[PDB]
């Protein structure tokens, strides 16, 4: 044996950042008793394969860390120093501070007299780092106590995934997974810096080039990714739209598409109505007033049973196929060219390579991330991504699919559970003031008289239902619905969002904020706003691993923690290896892990942080009594607990969810108490209790499905990575979504090679069929509407096609394909002092916010300081030397960094003039490391996009001059 | 004996290998500053068995040659270090024959250090400052000897880093130059006759490092 490992116990994990969802072995001292003595890989995890990046590898050094938190720290207004604290005062304290300022706040009824039943002065950010149980109850705690202000990391990025690919396919998640990239013959990176950002990810991209694949990455930067890829494009900053236009004319003029798969499976037969138009950049029905559109304009022409009348010979002039070839024709090579900045020859080998995948014996895939999000034009990008892949029947296939990437380990959980303003778990929407019952609720669903259109949210009053029978399990639904809080249906909904939040907080409209495992003073755009807006609060609650830039705002540069009368709790929770839970992956895996080691000094897991923190708010309310008691008190929160503590296993088997007494349904028996096994059989008559109805499946009779690490599989299933017996995914392990769409009529795969599913013997035969149903019986998409992948989406804001507005304000002054240049639905200064494209990124080494990462000593060795990557064209302009300190400033703020001069980096051709982009990375802080450097969003502009609410991360301009 | 095949066609200079080393050994981190490069610790030392390399060349057309080097001892059939170090006290340097490691022990606080690394044609042995004992990659030699793949293997994603027994790896090193080839074609393996770590360059290796080569 090996001295190091001989008397430790193995363990398996999870990583805890990045949402390929790597697995780990951590080996603890003492058999299990001691610290965690070794972390690396698990051989056996069939996504890494043992394998991890420099952040998963260093793990151990996260973990077993001595400036980690240890105890409960407090911070008095006015004062300059942390007061160690116990943890029983720390949450008897907390627990004042939310009844006082909640008794203060509440509102039983809006201005217009409506019930809501809500608390505006207490806000919540966070947290996709949590365990799927943790944040599910987190959510739960919040909207008990009245909240509607709950926040994290999913709106930033990928709030604009979840609208484009919802109108597309009906769902928002990524189509496949990690694996299923190997199947592919073009990968398309495209926003992603995915070697990087999701460097195990390129296991799977490599693997597909071995087979015959070509990679190719479109970006601004060259990269690591662009160093392994066959075609590296150059493209400007915000000039995807024209880049996918033109794919889209290229397909489309050349047919290039999949005819009987666009014919059968997408709605391009459907008959738009006549008073759909467009021209000089404006769709019909434009209110040129308000700046928004009346989207009735846009509705399809209906039968005589209201449903969508259709042409399936694609003849018809309202067709949306034929209206799709209209509207593309004006994304020519020469005019995408010249706006793009990449060379017709370039344009012409992509075009050709990717749309080979039009083939039924071809898959292309697209991998984007923070490249399309964090731009104002991202949910345009992604409809535009997603309807190439529609033309090319490259969804529900495996190699192809929308693989909009996830961040975060648990972003994907987190979203899953309702720690966004607008929905409760599973995606049902947060009430709104004119939802005044639950029959009303339900009555929003929309309903489809096509017999084969599944239309599956019809099932939503089963699990709306079961989710307030998990939360109040005696309450009758229609009561229970009461407890819970509601939005202004009044208000723009990004009202409750990440962006006014922030705003809100710099009115002094918030005297609460839990800061839950985020870094907002690094992490929000406009760190300096943010910073000074800390201060207008009366407490903090910052739960984390590590003192931070957040807990510590009052001490930092330029503050003066005298005159800042903030109070602060920081309470120090454990690393992922010292408890035990679930993470699902971008791929919708829902991953087990173990405890290692036991949570390091008196760190606590964020389950018994919260629930501790719960009761302590729950027996004061049955002491004193105060505004609206009943959500607080009939809070189920003894399904959450075993042995005095957070139990992982017994909130996931609630958020599966069981039988509350015995009942038949889909014509079987079910007793008790026993476990539901699958959201099938959930009911809306209160038979059933389901936390998630997505998590209905995960943990039945059967077992802890989450838990599994058998890598059995068929042939068919091997052929393609499935490994449907590792871990479960949501929805009931449908490995890759919308799999109807990969047969034909007859339910014969368009590609047996790499078949998903097939009709073998009356049966689906491979992955778990995406909609019950026999061939040729159902429209594959069964979670939209009408049945069909969406070409054209008439509910997006902004029209039912992609068009062309300019995201870079200030360089800009033509749009080239009408005469409408910006977003004419959605006042940056372009102040001519900074000259320069300042955008942000990441390297492999480092995480997030870097609070992490900057206390890892092996990843502060690899990247110790912020820099400044920029062309030899510009270090030439600015007389700038590689590894000169240089300043970089905005209207926002002004920093320092050491310059990375590189041809990585080249000037953009925008209109006959060579325009400079700057390149910083988000990962440093005035914490730690020392002469580490601060935030880059000391830089970043506070307001963006008011559709979406994401601020202007990757396009901000600034200047740089050498120190 | 045990060989490395490294595919530098596959490295997205991760760096996983570079920080699985020092997690494995519990090695420190050394203090470094940004001096215009990703590229940190900057060189070898005592505390550093591996860093990976990086080196910017110019291309035609869009994008640059990116060329990564995660450098570390070659483990020399016949290694100039043993002989060198041979000279001042035998014992000092050993070869386990079972693997084919060249491994430093305690004794080359003994022998002199400045000879032992200038007979090195890769330039890979480094004196602690203090003790003027010799560091360098040991192969993971424990590991592979309990039938482990070493750590910076283990932890490779890309396919890059490789293991096994020698005859196995130098068929995978020749069926690997030959496909690879057909996408970078001045691909060559480094010194594939004399080295347990046989790297394939994707271009002419010195262009990767001074020292990629002999
Ligand atoms: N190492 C590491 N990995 C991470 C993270 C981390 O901090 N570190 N964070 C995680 C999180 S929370 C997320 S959301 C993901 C995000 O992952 P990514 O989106 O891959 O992250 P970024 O590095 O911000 O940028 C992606 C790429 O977008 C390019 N880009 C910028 N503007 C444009 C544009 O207008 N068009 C196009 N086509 N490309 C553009 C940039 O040049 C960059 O190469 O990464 C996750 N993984
Ligand atoms: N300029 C610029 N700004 C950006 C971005 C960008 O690309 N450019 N990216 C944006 C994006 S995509 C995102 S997601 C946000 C992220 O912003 P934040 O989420 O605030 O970032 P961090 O706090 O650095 O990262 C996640 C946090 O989870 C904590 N954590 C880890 N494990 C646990 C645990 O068990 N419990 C708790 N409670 N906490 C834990 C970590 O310590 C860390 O503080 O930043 C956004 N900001
Ligand atoms: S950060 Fe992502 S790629 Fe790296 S080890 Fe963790 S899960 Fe795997
Ligand atoms: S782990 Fe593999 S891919 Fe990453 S830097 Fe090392 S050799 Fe290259
Ligand atoms: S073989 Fe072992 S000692 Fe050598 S570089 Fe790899 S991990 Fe480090
Ligand atoms: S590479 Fe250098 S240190 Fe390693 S065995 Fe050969 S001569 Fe000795
Ligand atoms: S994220
Ligand atoms: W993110």
Known sequence: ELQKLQWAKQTTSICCYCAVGCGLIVHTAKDGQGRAVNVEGDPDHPINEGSLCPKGASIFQLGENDQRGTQPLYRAPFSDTWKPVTWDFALTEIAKRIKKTRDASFTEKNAAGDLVNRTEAIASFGSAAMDNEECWAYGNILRSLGLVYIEHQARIXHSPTVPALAESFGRGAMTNHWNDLANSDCILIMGSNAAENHPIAFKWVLRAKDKGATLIHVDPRFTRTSARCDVYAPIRSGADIPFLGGLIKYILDNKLYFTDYVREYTNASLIVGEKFSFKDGLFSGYDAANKKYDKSMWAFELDANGVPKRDPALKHPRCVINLLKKHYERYNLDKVAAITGTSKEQLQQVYKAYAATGKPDKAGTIMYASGWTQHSVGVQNIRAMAMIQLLLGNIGVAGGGVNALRGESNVQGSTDQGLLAHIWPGYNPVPNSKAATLELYNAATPQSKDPMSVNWWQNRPKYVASYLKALYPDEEPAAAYDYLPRIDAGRKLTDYFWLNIFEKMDKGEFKGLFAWGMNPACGGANANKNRKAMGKLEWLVNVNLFENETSSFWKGPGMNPAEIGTEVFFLPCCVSIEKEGSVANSGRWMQWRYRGPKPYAETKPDGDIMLDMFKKVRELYAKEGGAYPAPIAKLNIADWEEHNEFSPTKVAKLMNGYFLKDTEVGGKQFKKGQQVPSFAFLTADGSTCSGNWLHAGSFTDAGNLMARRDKTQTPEQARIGLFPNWSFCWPVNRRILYNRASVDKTGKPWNPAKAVIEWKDGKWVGDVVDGGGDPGTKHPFIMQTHGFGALYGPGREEGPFPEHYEPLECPVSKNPFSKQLHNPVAKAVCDPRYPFIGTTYRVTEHWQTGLMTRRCAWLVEAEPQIFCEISKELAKLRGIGNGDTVKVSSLRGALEAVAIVTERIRPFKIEGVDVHMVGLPWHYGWMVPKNGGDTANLLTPSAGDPNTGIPETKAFMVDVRKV | ?214
């Open chain 2, 1 to 214: 004996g045990k060989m490395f095949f490294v595919d530098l066609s596959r490295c997205t200079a991760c760096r996983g290998c570079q920080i699985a080393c020092k997690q494995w050994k519990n090695l420190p981190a050394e203090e470094t500053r940004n001096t215009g490069s990703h590229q940190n610790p900057p060189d070898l030392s005592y505390v550093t068995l591996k860093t990976v390399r990086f080196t910017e060349k110019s291309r035609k057309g869009p994008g640059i040659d990116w060329l990564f080097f995660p450098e570390q001892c070659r483990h020399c059939v016949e290694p100039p270090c043993k002989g060198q170090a041979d000279v001042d006290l035998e014992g000092a340097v050993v070869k386990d024959e079972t693997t084919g490691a060249v491994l430093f022990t305690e004794l080359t606080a003994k022998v002199d250090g400045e000879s032992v690394r200038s007979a090195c044609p890769y330039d890979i042995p480094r004196i602690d400052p203090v003790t003027k004992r010799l560091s360098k990659c040991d192969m993971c030699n424990d590991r592979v000897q309990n039938g482990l793949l070493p750590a910076c293997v283990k932890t490779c994603p890309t396919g890059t880093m490789n293991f096994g027994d020698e005859q196995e790896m130098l068929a995978l090193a020749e069926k690997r130059l030959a496909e690879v080839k057909k996408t970078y074609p001045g691909a060559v393996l480094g010194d594939p006759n004399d080295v347990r770590v046989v790297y394939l360059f994707t271009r002419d290796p010195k262009d990767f490092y001074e020292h990629a080569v002999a």
